[PDB]
Amino acid sequence: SGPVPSRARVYTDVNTHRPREYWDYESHVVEWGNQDDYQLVRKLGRGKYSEVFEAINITNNEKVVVKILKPVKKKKIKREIKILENLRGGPNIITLADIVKDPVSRTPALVFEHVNNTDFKQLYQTLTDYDIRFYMYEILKALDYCHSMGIMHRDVKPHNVMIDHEHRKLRLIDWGLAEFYHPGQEYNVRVASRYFKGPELLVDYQMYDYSLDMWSLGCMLASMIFRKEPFFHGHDNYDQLVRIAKVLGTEDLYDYIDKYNIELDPRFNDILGRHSRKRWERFVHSENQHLVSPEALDFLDKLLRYDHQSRLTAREAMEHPYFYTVVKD
């Protein structure tokens, strides 16, 4: 009767072995810093849930970024704080330096280590082959770390990667959609940005895991090596699945639906069509061919798979031959 369950194949039980305090973010007691330490310099942007400012720590003259959380569903604030505290110090994870109560909004303001207000979307269509491999490896360090800590990011996309290209440093940011992975839990499918949403989300399969982030990463990789922004260019969440099926084929999609006993939304019957998988060479052309190698195509092929259980994990991805040419350390 209805969809059958799924588990992560790695890091399945990390939260079950933790003290309740690790993952029970609703019970977390925020420790507050001194709002007087920070002076706002200029507004950088405004999300659905926050406003972000360049700021200065007056106590040491060091630049920081301040993210003032909007009203929001209040539970989501403690979730982001606890995740950021749990991950602090991990490889390529943005560092939460402080949490203060903003005097004007009267809401929490997260103070982050300074990063150059340059996100990966500004650079990722201009990198050399070597730099694509280098920065993909850096992103994978962050994803394996958070997955190993029981956390899925759920919003991997170029705007959530901050890059200091002069210093060859990268940080994975915006943990406001991240969640703790609990085996057998059903999650909200209204996560990730349209072009980066995994098939599990698009077919309304709720028992997903860390492997969602590996699909999103694959969408970023495909966009970079093929110079196609985005790779899967859906006009809405339904057409998004059709765009995927035009590349990966409908037979493997129906096999995925069949395996997890998913009831596909009947609105797909008139739009999905019948498609065969395309060989990845179809996307290679004179402008992108210097970014494509057998290793890049084999790696991408193992990320962009309908069945979330079949995708490479972050650690398996770091083992791939695509990264043999990247200098380690």
Ligand SMILES: O=C(O)[C@@H]1O[C@@H](O[C@H]2[C@H](O)[C@@H](NS(=O)(=O)O)[C@@H](O[C@H]3[C@H](O)[C@@H](OS(=O)(=O)O)[C@H](O[C@H]4[C@H](O)[C@@H](NS(=O)(=O)O)[C@@H](O[C@H]5[C@H](O)[C@@H](OS(=O)(=O)O)[C@H](O)O[C@H]5C(=O)O)O[C@@H]4COS(=O)(=O)O)O[C@H]3C(=O)O)O[C@@H]2COS(=O)(=O)O)[C@H](OS(=O)(=O)O)[C@@H](O)[C@@H]1O
């Ligand atoms: O100039 C640019 O830089 C732009 O870059 C790319 O767009 C990025 C946005 O700039 C960025 N905005 S943010 O202010 O920095 O955060 C961010 O967009 C996300 C925002 O939340 C929002 O974008 S907005 O322009 O600020 O309005 C938009 O949110 C969508 C949700 O994704 C969508 N969720 S769903 O799962 O598809 O259903 C839905 O939310 C509705 C839903 O019912 C409920 O939300 S929930 O959280 O899923 O539960 C809730 O009820 O709210 C609903 C709602 O608000 O409508 O729709 C909203 C609204 O979207 S829309 O109607 O304006 O289309 O998209 C978010 C997102 O992550 O996409 O990030 C994007 C992407 O960054 S990137 O992938 O790195 O590029 C764009 O460039 S490109 O994508 O064309 O290549 C472009 O907009 C621009 O070029």
Ligand SMILES: O=C(O)c1cccnc1
């Ligand atoms: O995590 C965030 O939302 C963030 C972190 C650093 C810079 N800007 C945003």
